Design a protein around this ligand. Sequence first.
Ligand SMILES: [Cl-]
Ligand SMILES: [Cl-]
Ligand SMILES: [Cl-]
Ligand SMILES: [Cl-]
Ligand SMILES: [K+]
Ligand SMILES: [K+]
Lengths: 379, 379, 358, 358
Amino acid sequence: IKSALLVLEDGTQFHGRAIGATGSAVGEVVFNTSMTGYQEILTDPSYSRQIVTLTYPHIGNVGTNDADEESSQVHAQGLVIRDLPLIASNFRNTEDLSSYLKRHNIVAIADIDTRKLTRLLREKGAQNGCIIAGDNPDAALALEKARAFPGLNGMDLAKEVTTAEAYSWTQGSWTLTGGLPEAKKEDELPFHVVAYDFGAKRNILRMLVDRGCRLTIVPAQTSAEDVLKMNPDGIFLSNGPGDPAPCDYAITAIQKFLETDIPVFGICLGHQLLALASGAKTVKMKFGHHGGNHPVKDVEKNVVMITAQNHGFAVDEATLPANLRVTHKSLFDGTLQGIHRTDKPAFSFQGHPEASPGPHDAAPLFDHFIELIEQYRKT
Amino acid sequence: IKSALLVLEDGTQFHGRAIGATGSAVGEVVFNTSMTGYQEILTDPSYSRQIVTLTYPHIGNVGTNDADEESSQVHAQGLVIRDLPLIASNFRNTEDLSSYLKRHNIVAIADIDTRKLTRLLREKGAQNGCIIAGDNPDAALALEKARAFPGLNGMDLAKEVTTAEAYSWTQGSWTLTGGLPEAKKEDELPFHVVAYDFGAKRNILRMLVDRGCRLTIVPAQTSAEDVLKMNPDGIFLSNGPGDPAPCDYAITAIQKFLETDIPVFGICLGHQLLALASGAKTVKMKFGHHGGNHPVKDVEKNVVMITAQNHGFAVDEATLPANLRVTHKSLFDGTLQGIHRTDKPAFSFQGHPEASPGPHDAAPLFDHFIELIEQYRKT
Amino acid sequence: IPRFNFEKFAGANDRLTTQMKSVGEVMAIGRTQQESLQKALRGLEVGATGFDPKVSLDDPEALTKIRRELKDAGADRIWYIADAFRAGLSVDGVFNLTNIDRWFLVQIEELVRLEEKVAEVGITGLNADFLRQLKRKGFADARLAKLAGVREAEIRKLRDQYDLHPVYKRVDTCAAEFATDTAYMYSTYEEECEANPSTDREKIMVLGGGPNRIGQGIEFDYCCVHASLALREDGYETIMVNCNPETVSTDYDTSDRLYFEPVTLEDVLEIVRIEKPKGVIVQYGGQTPLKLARALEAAGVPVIGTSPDAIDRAEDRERFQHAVERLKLKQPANATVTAIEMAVEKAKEIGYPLVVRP
Amino acid sequence: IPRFNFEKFAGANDRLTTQMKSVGEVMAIGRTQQESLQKALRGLEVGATGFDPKVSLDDPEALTKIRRELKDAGADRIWYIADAFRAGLSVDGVFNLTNIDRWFLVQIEELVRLEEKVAEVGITGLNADFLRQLKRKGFADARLAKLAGVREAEIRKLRDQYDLHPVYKRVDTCAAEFATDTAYMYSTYEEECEANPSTDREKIMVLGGGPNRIGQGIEFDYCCVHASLALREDGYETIMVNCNPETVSTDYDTSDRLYFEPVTLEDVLEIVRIEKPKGVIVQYGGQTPLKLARALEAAGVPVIGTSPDAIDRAEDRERFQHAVERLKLKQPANATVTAIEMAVEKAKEIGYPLVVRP
Ligand SMILES: [Cl-]
Ligand SMILES: [Cl-]
Ligand SMILES: [Cl-]
Ligand SMILES: [Cl-]
Ligand SMILES: [K+]
Ligand SMILES: [K+]
């Protein structure tokens, strides 16, 4: 019997079984409705300082494998699931989930009422929490650790997950037949795009190269100046953890980029930056958007897309400068999903066009970016 | 595939399989002929800085369990075997060998010609060596490390494994029916024995307790004055790793004891220490004695006992003070195995009366010690 | 789980293939696969309480039967699979024979292992900790009882004791990301209860027939719906209990509250426990609920309409013969023969031709 | 491994019990248990090359037979155990029927799994690494040959090709803690060789008969021993090859060098390979060594005494009739019938009473 326990701020306790590493974990507790893609979810930098609870009871049915890693490591602070399957049954599986969590030293519990928990989060809103996996989990200590958490609000996490130095990315996407392709010769890739690592997911990068872009991955606090020196075909602003609001360095930069004619495209966090730099305000959601079944409408086309969502902050539509048009909107709750600058080659999306895991419905958003680049190069 | 490599000082290589933790281990290599008792052997402090090769091909058949631990941890530097069984098959097993090794972070190799290795050590004498377990084991590096090993001669390891602070020991032996007993109460043990921790095996303590001694386990460097102050019914000198020679603090104190009428008994290193303090000399053996089928004659009675041996140094019989009478000799090589002070209540055995593992044949050695104590209390 | 009727077709080929041969199907919802699967087995209306054994353990030819059943599937294959584990076949061996994904097989295996424990420890061994573990795996009272050598009710009382009852969760299409005003629930052994019964209205319970089979068709379900539509119109709070995925009865629109559960004593009693209806209709869903009436009334269930006893009076061949007698009505000459030779004589009496009912 | 002769006692109860029914025994030594066991099986003189199957994979009835053979042990048990793994039974399954420690079972199962890979990859898949791993688990060329669907010589060719030969270790009573001047050896697939043959003397090899069976008793061993004592006395360096633990022949004092090995072509050729004897006696160990004479000679072994061909001449009914003929000697009336009716007619010819030899 390996105990594990989860206690929330509110003192709500969840008694379960330990399936990962021994120890404690603390962060914001969130729920994700994704019935597939657990591995991709765990390795999503956006999840830094977050304890993840998955709605789908059976997490681990297909084990794990390297190709399903969205980053170099598991960024999620902890994992909460209903059932941990006896085995992994997938030709792609290279390592069972328990061993994998253990390997990556992740604190995680199973066998709890993930439903009860979800309802609580959705009703009362996000809550910081703590997991304690050990011989005799101390409920008090847990609550203490939980209450003591500083809180994502106003927390710059982007600076904690970004790359030390910059680097190049010329790798495209996976295929069933071919798996993960060898990385593309630099001379082989048409466009050069500079991308700000705010805790960038590999799939984004891969989908860019897939589109003819060579990439230069830069640290978060990189200066616009340093960038403009590179003679970028376009600039990219990745996804990433925490509050977009305290990221002064990037907002500033972005603004500089905004004086140029350079094409600018942002995803998730990047979308929030683009907005802030644009003059709008952000807000922290009650519980956010975490799942892969989220309908979003391209208002312009009046069409719907099923999308991958991972965000706890949003752009307040009501503070939008006018140089900022509304492009997309959540069909679930009315919240802001996309924007384009009326005056510049700059646009962004709140969900994940790159999915992984999730519907490939929003992928074409990239296409537009390219369109801006190609036209830029035309000039 | 999980590689492992073993390289000797002389450059001899052994390629195998990794069965323990990833990494490298360096030390003196020895071979032990015990067909059973692997765990006990692994947890024997006397094996500190030594790489243990087992001559019996299948090691781990019975897994492992706490009762078979001869100390708080695995002291062997590494483990070298021929074959690691598919399963542990014994009602007593609580963890398979491999898992246990990994848990103790021990570097271990299997699938090598231990016979060749054994014949090599026998023929040429002990050698330092290094095991490297990992992705691509560097044999040149292994050789470097092995060659760099300072070696056991002149090395005091006793001070290395001794207890930091003194403590009491009142737990007796294990039984099939009952397992390991609850530690006795002090008022339940007639005699009080002060035992020097030079890397003492639990079985010795347990056995002593079985005989009526409550124990006070003291640091290797503890002064005679400090001890004497305790009013010991007798003084015990434990087994332990390395050269006995360099242990000046010990020799000094023993000499002091030797001025009193307090009974003194030593096992293994303690035997070596008692001899040195009485003016004899110690030598490093070609390869030493490491097994559980070693005949030792009690010259006085002319009887043979099958013994548990674990030693690489010996007392030179041809340098024995006339006050030191030979009580036992090895029937394998005629080396010194027992001595008694002709003028003082002090004796010692080169082997391990407490066995664990091995034959119980020499246990009566303890009894003689109790004798001295009872008589000493008579006075 | 599909429902078959092979016994009605003695001469037919009972092996499963690409042409459908099932007559109906039952559905179950569980917080886990195990739970879900066992719930479906118990709601199948085949006399199964779960993974009831099909072959004896002491049967020397048992491995042969099991192998055939595994290699060339019939409607009983699900049971033969647990029998395989009992008999010592490995998950791999089973897999090679069935090609059923190991992910599923391993779970059945686990269940078998736990079954074994039960069997070993007996009713004594069913502490609350373990009993709860078993319930969370979908184990039925009836099943555990056979394993422990006790009446189903004993296991059920036992749960009363430990205050070991299921909780009701809701179907909402969105994994609880959104609130729901609909009462479409299922039972699970979890923490939070979502039933939230009303204290407000008088409630009426309608018991469905489970999966359709020959003789137990849509006709009964039709009735069931009508009971619901009617009483609700009449302002009663209607609660449907059924687990047939094909019908109108299991359409959340059809009643106020829908409990998508096995139409068993156990399952029903749990609903009634929290619901405490004014009454329960068991005369409309066919043989399924009918067979539960007696037991339900005994457990203090408010069975409305023709009493279970009345029912029995008609169905009992003896009870009935009596009242027809009493009504001075015409019935065909009958006899209740035990032995062959008895029949021949009794036969001579009655007169040929003859209808032999077993 | 004990040796039985049930076939000779048709009417006998052939199940193993507390009263011995065995007629002899074989012994093997290996650096691992798998190696040891497999070597024993191939030296048992029953036609085994290791774990040869007893029942077919496609026999629907196989699991019933397998189960019977495990539950109630006969002499074939060891072979039925691998057949059980082959058929999907688990280690726990096999344990419950046999009570043989899992420690041993798991090892047999691992062999089966390896056999499965061999069968799959075929001769082509037998690269030097894999083949060496197999050899290390005690697999005979003969068993590999069968799985790969080639002649045994083909596997042996391959080893020559890879220079994959065994090494010889010595028995010493002390796990190598002390040197030995005795040459009591066994083969294994290891690193260091301790054979250290002599280049000095004219060597004579004597092949034993393995385990005794009815008809192949001590008398053959007796001869084997004498050859050794004689030739040794005459100054020859005597090399004894046998694996019967009960006999004098396997006493280290009886010969200069003793190779306690399976008396198989495979095993003998490897010894010859390194000893390079002057001659080999195959005529004294009974059937076992006789059966190997031709192959040895052909593989280039210096068989001494009555040639293989000669022996053949005498053993072959046909060749013989021919010689007896040639010498104008008396031989009972004989025929070689193929069919029944053919025999009736021929029988007429020959004359009753008759001796019908298979
Ligand atoms: Cl919970
Ligand atoms: Cl806010
Ligand atoms: Cl080696
Ligand atoms: Cl020396
Ligand atoms: K729980
Ligand atoms: K090797």
